[PDB]
């Protein structure tokens, strides 16, 4: 029996950076080589386990998070790296074990005129804890009592759309990305083939 990989990598529409799609994948004879028939795999690097010798090892619980980011921000999904998407809307721990897979996809995501469908939290108060997802879309403060639902000194909504178009440089193109979280210590082999 196989498990959901061709239902995590062939999704029609991916979620936004601040709305990643958490999932669990267990009870399956898991073959990590269905990946290689997918794409050129622009970004593929594994921490804690080698990709070549992956198909044999077994894991406790494997989580998968899928979303879409810009071109020059794929580097920010790494343990301990600070930025604007890592420090504001998606942060993974320093002891992370698993790996990340990002493949440029702008044949299905950029429209002529700007696809205002993917957003990302630009403003917040402080950093977030690992794997902490929030959806609140209140109007950001303005230091003093803000211009709640109005304009003024500093009343800036927190979400901002990416707006992909087919004239953007390769640095501004959309990139789909999936993050796999493993467990390896004393594991009761439940997902492996």
């Amino acid at each position, epitope marked *: 029996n196989l498990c959901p990989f061709d239902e995590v990598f062939n999704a*029609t529409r991916f979620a936004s950076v601040y709305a990643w799609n958490r999932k669990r994948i267990s009870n399956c004879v898991a073959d990590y080589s269905v990946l290689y028939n997918f794409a050129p795999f622009f970004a593929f690097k594994c921490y804690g386990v080698s990709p070549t010798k992956l198909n044999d090892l077994c894991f406790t619980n494997v989580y998968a998070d899928s979303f879409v980011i810009r071109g020059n921000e794929v580097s920010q999904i790494a343990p301990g790296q600070t930025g604007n998407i890592a420090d504001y809307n998606y942060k993974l721990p320093d002891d992370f074990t698993g790996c990340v897979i990002a493949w440029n996809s*702008n*044949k*299905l995501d*950029s*429209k*002529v*005129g700007g*696809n205002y*469908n993917y957003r990302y939290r630009l403003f917040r108060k402080s950093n977030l804890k690992p794997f902490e997802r929030d959806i609140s879309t209140e109007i950001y403060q303005a230091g003093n009592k803000p211009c709640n639902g109005v304009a003024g000194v500093n009343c800036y909504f927190p979400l901002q759309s990416y707006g992909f*178009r*087919p*004239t*953007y*440089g*390769v640095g501004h193109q959309p990139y789909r990305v999936v993050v796999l979280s493993f467990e390896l210590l004393h594991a009761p082999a439940t997902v492996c083939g």
Partner: antibody
Amino acid sequence: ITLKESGPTLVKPTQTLTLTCTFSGFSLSTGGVSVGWIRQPPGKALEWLALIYWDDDKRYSPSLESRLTITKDTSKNLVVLTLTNMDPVDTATYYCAHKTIPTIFDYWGQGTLVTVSS
Amino acid sequence: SALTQPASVSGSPGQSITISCTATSSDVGAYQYVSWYQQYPGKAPKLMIYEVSKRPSGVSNRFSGSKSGNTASLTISGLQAEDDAYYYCNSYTTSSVVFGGGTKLTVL
């Protein structure tokens, strides 16, 4: 893949012109697929008009927007373009081609010549 | 104004010829997708090449594009009498797709 346009061949000044482009071989459900319209005056260059994506996100040409409302019906696979206020400038050929992101307008239809005058 | 194409070209039959589609406009973006169309004497344009140096399977192996920066050099090798036709270039700008002014190719 195949497309075919149809509609009124003749129209009078300051009138609402309508055209229906029926396609076969593909649908408007798969990703990337979209449908746009183009016109060409006699002996002049082609031009863009509008576009309807597969996500029901619609786009028009900047100069000539606020008109030519492009609608669609995915059950019988038909797209409809309607542009009002006919002028003698609008007398030209019209084509409905399918757009992918890189291969822009790779599948064109036949095209129907339409006249705008008394 | 949006793109720019020469008036016409006439190459002797059996030779090569290049055509230029300069943008002549700032901020056309990255100028990465530039498609070329074959216009017959009163027929629907046919896609010849897309994605600069790329080409859709179904056409000959003589057409080849290039980019000297801001333009698209459409090339035609082994010119045959069948190639007498109109040619156009096409590439989105920030707001909307634009076309070229047209080019005429008559073989003599």
